[PDB]
């Protein structure tokens, strides 16, 4: 089997991407944020505290003939941005792009934090990291990918995120029309539950490439590129008037600037992030200070190759017995 679904930016900045997902029988279509940095499939639901729902589409298990309460199971998750949700669990049929999983754990939110409520465009998350991170207790649950894997033509999914445009998530096959050149594969550590890999270095604009190991995670559910402070300082030093602002919470730059590209290494291969991809626009409406798309990881504990990096590439998440991660230019 295979599946193929279009993923669409939620706003003009590519803050996140939503992909339609069919849940239940008859289908209830919810727009979920596919997140390679987490492992829960959770949804706004008929159980979500009414004051915490503002425009989201909800999953109503009582209207699904295939929904079953997963008796006693609960979930609770916190994300890198301080957002959180929790609730109880149903099993149901879930389809993505024509690929169906029966008996998928669908985590129904009873509570969500303010950042979720305030984002009317995101109806929940579909986690695609390793199932070892899944928060369901007392019986940990599998991700949609882990449940689909054995049925797929090839145990892979691919992320092809657009810059200010729709893109694609494919399951079970690698679309050789979707990238240029070759795919470079690199090793993955599953030790922390993530698609964790080591970049071979970076360059700023037309500068020389610096060979250096940077260990980080491929995370479709993080907007920006978070890298070590040394790397980030070297990037922003090439932008007149850029500075780190403690008041704003990261590097800002004059909106009049033209940003340099940023290159990261994948083995001997190179992925170039155009400068435009790094511009996240005014810090507040009408401001002439703009927010940068490359930020320091020093306050995280992990480097994160989020959407700013991933959307410059065709990315293969290879879930074979020994997982790997492939990158191609496009």
Question: In the set 37, 87, 250, 323, which binds ligand RCV (CB under 6 A)?
Answer: 37
Is 276 one of the binding residues for ligand RCV (CB under 6 A)?
no
Burial group, residue 299, by CB count within 10 angstroms (0-12, 13-18, 19+): exposed
Query: Whole-number minimum distance, CB 169 to ligand RCV, in Å?
Result: 16
Q: Which residues of 43-66 are buried (b: 16+ CB within 10 A; e: fewer)?
A: bbbebbeeebbeebbbbebeebeb
Alpha carbon distance 213, 130 (integer Å): 23
> Scanning residues 202 to 231, which ones bind ligand RCV (CB under 6 A)?
221-223
> Scanning residues 302 to 321, which ones bind ligand RCV (CB under 6 A)?
304
Question: In the set 3, 9, 16, 194, which binds ligand RCV (CB under 6 A)?
Answer: 16
Site string for ligand RCV, 96-135 (x = CB under 6 A): ----------------------------------------
Q: Is 199 a catalytic residue?
A: yes
The CA-based angle 29-14-261, given to 5 degrees, is 150
The CA-based angle 116-117-123, given to 5 degrees, is 65
What single DSSP character describes residue 259?
Answer: P
Q: 246 or 321, CB closer to ligand RCV? A: 246
> Scanning residues 68 to 97, which ones bind ligand RCV (CB under 6 A)?
79-81
Is 54 one of the binding residues for ligand RCV (CB under 6 A)?
no
Q: Is 35 a catalytic residue?
A: yes
Q: 293 or 323, CB closer to ligand RCV? A: 293
In three-state secondary structure terms, 164 is: coil
Burial group, residue 165, by CB count within 10 angstroms (0-12, 13-18, 19+): exposed
Query: Whole-number minimum distance, CB 198 to ligand RCV, in Å?
Result: 19
Give the interface with ligand RCV as residue ranges (CB under 6 A): 16, 37, 79-81, 221-223, 304
Question: Residues with catalytic annotation?
Answer: 35, 199
């Amino acid at each position: 089997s295979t599946g193929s679904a279009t993923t669409t930016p939620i706003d003009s900045l590519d803050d996140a991407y939503i992909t339609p997902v069919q849940i239940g029988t008859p289908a209830q279509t919810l727009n979920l944020d596919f997140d390679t940095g987490s492992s829960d499939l959770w949804v706004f639901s008929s159980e979500t505290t009414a004051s915490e729902v503002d425009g989201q589409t909800i999953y109503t298990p009582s209207k699904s003939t295939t929904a079953k309460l997963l008796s006693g199971a609960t979930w609770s998750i916190s994300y890198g941005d301080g957002s959180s949700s929790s609730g109880d669990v149903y099993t149901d049929t879930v389809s993505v792009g024509g690929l169906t999983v029966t008996g998928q754990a669908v985590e129904s939110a009873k509570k969500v934090s303010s950042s979720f409520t305030e984002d009317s465009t995101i109806d929940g998350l579909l986690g695609l990291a390793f199932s070892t991170l899944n928060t369901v207790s007392p019986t940990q649950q599998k991700t949609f990918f882990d449940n689909a894997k054995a049925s797929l033509d090839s145990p892979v999914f691919t992320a092809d995120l657009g810059y200010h445009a729709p893109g694609t998530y494919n399951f079970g096959f690698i679309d050789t029309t979707a990238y240029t050149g070759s795919i470079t594969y690199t090793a993955v550590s599953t030790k922390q539950g993530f698609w964790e890999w080591t970049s071979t270095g970076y360059a700023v604009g037309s500068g020389t490439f610096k060979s250096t190991s940077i260990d980080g995670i491929a995370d479709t559910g993080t907007t920006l590129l978070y890298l070590p402070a040394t790397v980030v300082s070297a990037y922003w030093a090439q932008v007149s008037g850029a500075k780190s602002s403690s008041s704003v919470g990261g590097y800002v730059f004059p909106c009049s600037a033209t940003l340099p590209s940023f290159t990261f290494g994948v083995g001997s291969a190179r992925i170039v992030i155009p400068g435009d991809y790094i511009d996240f626009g005014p810090i507040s409406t009408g401001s002439s200070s703009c927010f940068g798309g490359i930020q320091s990881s020093a306050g995280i504990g992990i480097n994160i190759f989020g959407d700013v990096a991933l959307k410059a590439a065709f990315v293969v998440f290879n879930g074979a017995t020994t997982p790997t991660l492939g990158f191609a230019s496009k």
